[PDB]
Design a protein around this ligand. Structure first.
Ligand SMILES: CCCCCCCCCCCCCCCC(=O)O
Ligand SMILES: CCCCCCCCCCCCCCCC(=O)O
Lengths: 238, 256, 55, 273, 238, 273, 125, 55
């Protein structure tokens, strides 16, 4: 009988423990593996894949394809804001239900640059230039184009190349940010403006749509595994 | 003198051409191929019709109207009545395939819209009435698209499909369908969409009637739109070609 | 015959499997492989970032 | 870098060429590979961040209560029974459903607790309770009463536990009849496309049965048995969109149409309202 | 006292556990072994041995040798079915109590080809040819000979070699099938037909019998050990 | 292949020779060695299926409750007694009887549980129960009362257990007087072919005795003792047909004639009816 | 231990046996085989179903009565509705095949008769 | 002196016997020997599959 001495923790049951345990099926012959397309090794592999962002949460539209449409049309001026949402990949309703956001919501911390790809779905004859911008926190969200261009931005010119990317560089005072909301962990404001208004010819629709895709960059990571707020129940399903 | 806009695909006695495509999406990086001997179970000599079964089958076209919510086709199924590919499904217990899915849809420099062509593997669908499961007749449209609904579908002890587009009839965000092999037909730059899908499933082979491992979905995120003068009937045609089709367990025909 | 791996940090640990079935072993928490390509970029023709996607 | 490290940020300077990292074409189905330095001058950053906690294994490897029932000392329900399934709980089920097909071993853990029922029995003096959980694979004899011959378990695997001791636990191999567990099945059980439809046509994981071995006291006691799953040695294929609509039924994907996300004022409102 | 820490599972009693335990008979001298004919190492050794199948469950016959008899006789036509049972080595009453079936019923999964050996017990002067066939699931059981011959089959010609084998190749979508019943795991239909009716001379009985033996092939295996439904009791026997 | 792997399927093509794999003659007593490829074109299949779970050892190596009795705190039956035998339970007995002779060591496990009996005793305050199981080999003094000198066990082996702790357990060597345990014995105990007949003429495994060591409380308590057998290091010879008719008696093979199988409509019915 | 009386033929998922056959007649000495590239004209990739099409199809039996004069079957035709072999005929303009024709007919040491099984190529009537 | 065997899979484990009697050792769950011949084929004259069983 080898003199032993149990220590605190003994007999407990940690949900995240990691020990060996006897098989209930001694010598069971597992079914041989098989090459199945598209294996997944890390969730970040998924978070690097673009998914369509619902920038237009506005009212009832959340219950239609319109949620994914960004209104753009010919105006009698330029400088007009086209949209504007915060950099809260986890919290903001704009991202929260995205492929990226869904994943973030199973974690507590996030870090890395993010890509916002914008595809112009107007007509071949429609043209124009937009100013995609990212303003780090500290001041308020820019309210005029002339104040947004003072920050990190990309002047996108619509043409044969349908889409254009606004890479939101990870600028932050800490290594990681909270997936949940917190002002310490404030991420800044993402806004779009008209650089040079939409200009179509006759017989070509002057009102268009712009889609927005979001995905993580190669320097993106997530920490502290937690449960999603997005799924609930009252009783075991039957 | 070379443009990635142009492309041409040949499979059997059929060829397809485009002068305005994007790239070509290849499954999960995997390219279709027959079943390896170290990955099989069915012991009988399989049948590889090849050219007779792996060709381009053009389905019924469909009209894209300013309000169309979208369409969908179960894949093993959409061809179950086309040529020898179908005849082989009927005569064999087991089948295995990949497909080159080609969705065509031209407009003009003056129209606008953006379709989302996607191959969803294992697209189990929900029911309008939470206590039942959609019926075969409500899910399968075999060579004729199945339409998605612009708004919810009411309950009431029926075996209908919860065709609400923004939910892809699966209870998920329609905008997250991109984690599946896809392309976007954006009339502005695009004109067709090509996707090669490798066989997917949790087993080497499966019965082609009893199971539909992949479901093709076309869903406009940006609705069609033009102007008085521009033509109004803009169709969308789907062509699918089986790849490396193998069949085992030969017996009497009939999809009983 | 035990094994000796590296712990997670910013040292090693010893492990001896005690059961006759691999199913009984602890989790494989250190497989850091990654291959985004299968999902992001499943195009047949390689797309060079700096180039135009269409021409 | 370090097996699981993340990419380092490559320092960049002013540009003015015809190189267009920022212009692409989402229609291809290809996700852009742009990085900060491509659209703005960057500094160099040696990034040590690891993606260790994002591995399929670390993501699905945490015990999860997937179900629980109760059985009593005496009375009508003296033994419990549960057709094994991971789809009655929503937590774990939503994670597993992040992928189409999955393969893994399973670490089973049971939390068994008892509670004295209110009665009018005088001088109750309970003895320590000993339970018995038993697994019956599809095709095996089932218990019809707490003292059925079936609890002999000459071959069926079963655990015997006694209150006070650590939770009973045991490992289970990948039991699929196929090369991977299927999370979704857009098919039928009949070749006529009748019978069952959906995931449940594949679920044939048998039934679990619990019971007391002794009654303990003269008074009435009710025992609850919590079943926990913990996937080990995971391999997952074909990721899919995470479940959006709440779960409705346990044997199918039926849902009640839901909005794409929560709303907010206008496409200009920086607030979640 | 070596610092130790008990983990979940501690003190339990798994029926299928595998540990060392002190002998109650310290140093007991076991009786020396002896060479006994026919040792058994694996149950499959037994499952490879033919046993007579009771194809004729029909009514009261189950209580007589008749259960093992397959009626064959001269007709005024050909094409007539002679028998037909499913491929459910575990469930179907035809197999369930066989040597193979008994074993299968102690397991949950099975896989492999199966051999059905048919011995013609007619008279030396009796002749004829039968069509032994196996139709994989998917369609229904063949109802006419012309529909059964469209599947895996063997045209057996009776002659000096009394028996003939119909090897039922393991065709299936999964590696294993359930021993219990389940339509996913459907195994198909085994049927027999008259290829060219029985033809005896005068003074020779025109009504005969055919026996059917069943056994596993060298690629047969069984998984997930369970209890048989075939044995029960109400109280400890006295 | 891999020690326990199964044969791989050899790819075959069209034939037309005078080779007759399919034609044989069961009269020989020989089982055909035909394989798919012999009567049909086959593909090649590298089969990785193992027969690991079919070894005589894995088949008989699972604890099985072979019997159980009870003894009480006080009253008439204050101690239990059981003539050791594996034939009172049907589960394990049917497996062992799959072979004529058998040889193995045995892992013994005991599940001891107590239950408070209904009475009218005021203020009951039970102390922890301690039991004693004792084995008496054929020829040894037997206890006549819960406090007989026999429970001294100076030489008899016996375990002392206390409720709450893990089930007591111990290993037992192959105890036969012969070169293998006999499961069947078509003979008598007398040379005149009188006396006993059948398996029971060989069973002389002695008796097991259980009892409490302390009464615990003033109130009455009943304890149940479950005996489990688990064959280890198994060797079996001469397989036989599995038991068909239900068991009737524990000391012989007596049965009540049973049909060969369940019935069905006609030799054409693909249904179990 | 070998007798030319016994024989067994396997083609696809089907096998045939005899314990009282004669020899086996092989065409005009030629054994069936696919079309060589130097002997073809059809430029398209042909289809070779193989196991699915080259199997044993058992036709409707027929009664031999003391007065039966005889029977006949046109070959490309007799199978035009059987399995995938037929399905391929319907779907294709061109086809090419050989066949293993097996005629069965047992009687007993006490009966008598003599049939003439023959394959007549190009049997215009 | 411990021993080291292979676990069941589609890795090894260490074992040290602690008792003086072999009876105390764990089960021999890995003996995959097989010899069907004793039962299927106990004929005195070897029967060659492809041949006729009688002549
Ligand atoms: C006392 C032994 C208990 C054994 C516990 C066995 C539990 C089996 C678990 C199966 C796991 C998850 C599978 C979902 C099945 C499916 O839908 O295909
Ligand atoms: C406390 C010590 C307990 C010892 C338990 C000894 C039990 C002996 C088991 C004998 C095993 C099975 C034998 C059947 C005997 C026969 O019929 O020949």
């Amino acid at each position: 009988g080898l003199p032993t001495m149990n220590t605190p923790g003994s007999c407990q049951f940690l949900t995240s423990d990691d020990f060996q345990s006897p098989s209930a099926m001694p010598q069971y012959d597992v079914t041989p593996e098989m090459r199945i397309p598209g294996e997944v090794k890390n969730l970040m592999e998924i978070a690097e894949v673009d998914s369509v962002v619902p920038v237009q949460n506005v009212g009832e539209k959340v219950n239609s394809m319109e949620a994914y449409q960004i209104p753009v049309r010919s105006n009698e001026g330029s400088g007009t804001q086209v949209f504007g949402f915060p950099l809260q990949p986890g919290y903001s309703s704009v991202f929260s239900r995205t492929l990226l956001g869904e994943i973030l919501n199973y974690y507590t911390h996030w870090s890395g640059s993010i890509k916002l790809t914008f595809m112009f779905c107007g007509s071949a004859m429609a043209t124009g230039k937009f100013l995609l911008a990212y303003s780090p926190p500290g001041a308020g969200a820019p309210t005029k184009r002339v104040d947004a261009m003072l920050g990190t931005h990309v002047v996108w010119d619509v043409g044969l190349q349908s889409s254009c990317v606004l890479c939101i560089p990870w600028i932050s005072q800490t290594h990681y940010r909270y997936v949940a909301s917190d002002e310490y962990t404030a991420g800044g404001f993402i806004t779009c403006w008209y650089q040079t208004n939409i200009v179509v010819p006759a017989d070509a629709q002057s009102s268009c749509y712009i889609m927005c895709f979001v995905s993580a960059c190669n320097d993106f990571s997530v920490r502290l595994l937690k449960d999603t707020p997005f799924i609930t129940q009252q009783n075991f399903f039957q | 003198g070379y443009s990635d806009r142009v492309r041409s695909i040949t499979l059997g006695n059929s060829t397809i051409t485009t002068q305005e495509c994007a790239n070509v999406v290849v499954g999960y990086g995997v390219w279709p191929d027959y079943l390896k001997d170290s990955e099989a179970t069915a012991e009988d000599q399989p049948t590889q019709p090849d050219v007779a079964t792996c060709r381009f089958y053009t389905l019924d076209s469909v009209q894209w109207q300013k309000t169309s919510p979208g369409w969908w086709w179960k894949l093993p199924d959409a061809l179950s009545n086309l040529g020898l590919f179908g005849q082989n499904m009927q005569y064999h217990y087991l089948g295995r395939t990949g497909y080159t899915v080609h969705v065509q849809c031209n407009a003009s420099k003056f129209h606008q819209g953006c379709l989302l062509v996607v191959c969803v593997p294992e697209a189990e669908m929900g029911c309008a009435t939470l206590d039942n499961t959609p019926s075969s007749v409500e899910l399968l449209g075999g060579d004729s698209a199945k339409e998605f609904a612009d708004k919810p579908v009411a309950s009431g002890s029926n075996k209908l499909v919860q065709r609400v587009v923004y939910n892809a009839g699966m209870g998920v965000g329609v905008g997250n369908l991109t984690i599946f092999p896809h392309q976007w037909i954006n009339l502005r730059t695009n004109n067709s969409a090509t996707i090669v899908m490798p066989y997917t499933n949790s087993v080497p082979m499966d019965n082609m009637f009893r199971h539909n491992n992949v479901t093709l979905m076309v869903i406009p995120f940006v609705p069609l739109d033009y102007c008085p003068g521009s033509t109004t009937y803009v169709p969308i045609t789907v062509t699918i070609a089986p790849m490396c089709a193998e069949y085992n367990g030969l017996r009497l025909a009939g999809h009983q | 015959g035990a094994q000796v791996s590296t712990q997670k940090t910013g040292i090693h640990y010893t492990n001896i499997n005690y059961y006759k079935d691999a199913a009984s072993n602890s989790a494989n928490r250190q497989d850091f492989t990654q291959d985004p390509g299968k999902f992001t970029e499943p195009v047949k023709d390689i797309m060079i970032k700096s180039l135009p996607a269409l021409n | 870098a370090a097996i699981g490290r993340v990419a380092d940020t490559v320092g960049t300077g002013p540009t003015n060429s015809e190189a267009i990292p920022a212009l692409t074409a989402a229609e291809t189905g290809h996700t852009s590979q742009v990085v900060p330095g491509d659209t703005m001058q960057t500094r160099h950053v040696k990034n040590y961040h690891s993606r260790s906690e994002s591995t399929i294994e670390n993501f699905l490897c945490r015990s999860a209560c997937v179900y629980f029932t109760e059985y009593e000392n005496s009375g009508a329900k003296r033994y419990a029974e549960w057709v094994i399934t991971p789809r009655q709980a929503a937590q774990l089920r939503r994670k597993l459903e992040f992928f189409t097909y999955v393969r893994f071993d399973l670490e089973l853990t049971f939390v068994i607790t008892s509670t004295q029922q209110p009665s009018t029995t005088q001088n109750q003096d309970a003895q320590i309770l000993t339970h018995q959980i038993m697994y019956v694979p599809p095709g095996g004899p089932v218990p019809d009463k707490v003292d059925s011959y079936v609890w002999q378990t000459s071959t069926n695997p079963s655990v015997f536990w006694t209150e006070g001791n650590a939770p009973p636990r045991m490992s289970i191999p990948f039991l699929s009849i196929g090369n991977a567990y299927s999370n979704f099945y857009d098919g039928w059980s009949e070749f006529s496309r009748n019978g069952v439809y959906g995931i449940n046509t594949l679920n044939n994981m048998g039934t679990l049965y619990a019971r007391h071995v002794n009654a303990g006291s003269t008074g009435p006691i009710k025992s609850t048995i919590r079943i926990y799953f913990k996937p080990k040695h995971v391999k997952a294929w074909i990721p899919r969109p995470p479940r959006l609509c709440q779960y409705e039924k346990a044997k199918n994907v039926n849902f009640q149409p839901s909005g794409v996300t929560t709303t907010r004022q206008s496409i200009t409102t920086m607030t979640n309202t």
